[PDB]
Design a protein around this motif. Structure first.
Motif: not given
Length: 172
Positions: A2, A4, A28, A30, A45, A47, A58, A61-62, A65
């Motif tokens: 994961k 982000g 994800t 962002i 995904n 956000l 939040d 979740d990753q 980042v």
């Protein structure tokens, strides 16, 4: 894995995202506006949140980042400040790894002094959380070094950590 990406619309963050997705990770995006991205990112995904509003919730979740902040002129004056926010939010943690992307020199990424500041602030929390600051080897010019090469390095460091909790410039 994961991952982000903050600033998944700008030059650097845009590829970092592609390279990540292509290497098979759950990416994800962002961002402030799902505007640019949605059109193209119909599978990844999303956000929608400005960096300043990000809460540990939040972020954890990753697994990683990527801070590729600086897509516009205004974001160019808020580099040191936005990172400070992430630093306090991330404190006392090993939860997501915070990978900060720079670009040593229109250029909306951290300036020369802005970077030094972030680094001084990062060192103030050397061991308080998991972070890495990455700098490119030479120089990019809108299409020495290609942005996609930088993305490959960035993702290498994510898959095979060699610079946990330190700043480092790409080599070769």
């Amino acid at each position: 894995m994961k991952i982000g990406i903050i600033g998944a619309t700008g030059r650097a963050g845009s590829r970092i995202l592609e390279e990540a997705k292509n290497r098979g990770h759950e990416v994800t995006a962002i961002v402030r506006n799902a505007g640019k991205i949605t059109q193209t990112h119909k599978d990844i995904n999303i956000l929608q949140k400005d960096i300043f509003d990000l809460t540990l919730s939040d972020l954890s979740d990753q697994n990683v980042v990527v801070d590729a902040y600086g897509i516009s002129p205004d974001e160019a004056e808020k580099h040191v400040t936005s990172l400070d926010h992430l630093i306090s939010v991330l404190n006392g943690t090993v939860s997501p790894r915070l990978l900060v992307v720079g670009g040593a020199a229109a250029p909306y990424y951290p300036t020369a002094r802005a970077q030094a500041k972030q680094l001084e602030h990062l060192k103030s929390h050397q061991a308080e959380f998991s972070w890495t600051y990455i700098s490119p080897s030479a120089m990019f010019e809108p299409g020495f070094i290609s942005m996609e090469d930088y993305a490959i390095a960035v993702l290498d460091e994510i898959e095979r950590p060699n610079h946990l909790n330190e700043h480092f410039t790409v080599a070769g």
